[PDB]
């Protein structure tokens, strides 16, 4: 199926409590593979997946150089944004950046991204065409004009369509045993009497990878959403994911209800009943 590489960067000012803190993380699909924390012991980009340990010293030096340079860029950005929004030097503020690329089942380029947020909301984003910018508000147009002048979009396009896709393929190969695996969910249903009048049916999916899954309830083979609860897909901590979906039913009617499970690791969807 499809794959992605993404980098996520967060900088937070803390005036009168030192200089800003900067954290960077890198993912392939749902698997983190690198981190950097400006306040941490190593002062280097660090591995977080086994397959990245195959990279040599020049890689670790270059990734460290680039991430430290980016941390300095965000420090400057924080001061500028304060000016743009006519804010005081006293409050804490947050800059975030994300970029990366998606590829299809054939591992060819599908889409690229490069976008920014200030204080929890959109600031500026490279459009899907990888040639123009969308400014979220009036203040952001000033950045748009500077970045247009610099012709940075051309450089970003070259990376997103080229290096990004090639290194994603590299990692997928080097970490094949884990990244290209499909762990189908282990499934089960529980029953609990909430009262004499109603019971809860809970349909579980455990130990699966990748994160993408669909859990749905039907009554008499018709889709049911009313009186259901579906939790956010969550990490188990071991590289796999968990999810459940529950429905509250009248006592004596449990047999009408079926849970349906769709996942990449399942050739055909699963049906569960009480």
């Amino acid at each position: 199926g499809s794959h992605s590489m993404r980098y996520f960067f967060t900088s937070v000012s803390r005036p009168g409590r030192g200089e800003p803190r900067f954290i960077a993380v890198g993912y392939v699909d749902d698997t983190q593979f690198v981190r950097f924390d400006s306040d941490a012991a190593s002062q280097r980009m660090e591995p977080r997946a086994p397959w990245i340990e195959q990279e040599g010293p020049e890689y670790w030096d270059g990734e460290t150089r680039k991430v430290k340079a980016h941390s300095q860029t965000h420090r400057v950005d924080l001061g500028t944004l304060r000016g743009y929004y006519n804010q005081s030097e006293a409050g804490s503020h947050t800059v975030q950046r994300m970029y990366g690329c998606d590829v299809g089942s054939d591992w060819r380029f599908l889409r690229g991204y490069h976008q920014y947020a200030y204080d929890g909301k959109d600031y500026i984003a490279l459009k899907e065409d990888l040639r123009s910018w969308t400014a979220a508000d009036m203040a952001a147009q000033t950045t748009k004009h500077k970045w247009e002048a610099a012709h940075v979009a051309e450089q970003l396009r070259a990376y997103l369509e080229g290096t990004c896709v090639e290194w994603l393929r590299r990692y997928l190969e080097n970490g094949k045993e884990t990244l290209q695996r499909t762990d189908a969910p282990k499934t089960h249903m529980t029953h609990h009497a909430v009262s004499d009048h109603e019971a809860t049916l809970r349909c579980w999916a455990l130990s699966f990878y990748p994160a993408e899954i669909t859990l749905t309830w039907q009554r008499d083979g018709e889709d049911q959403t009313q009186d259901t609860e579906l939790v956010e897909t969550r990490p188990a901590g071991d590289g796999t994911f968990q999810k459940w979906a529950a429905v509250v039913v009248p006592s004596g009617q449990e047999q009408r209800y079926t849970c349906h499970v769709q996942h990449e690791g399942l050739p055909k969807p699963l049906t569960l009943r009480w």
């Binding site: 980098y7 890689y59 990734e63 340079a69 400057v76 500077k146 940075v152 970003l156 290096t163």
Partner: peptide
Amino acid sequence: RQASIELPSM
């Protein structure tokens, strides 16, 4: 692998 691009000031 990260982009080898220094972005301009905002």
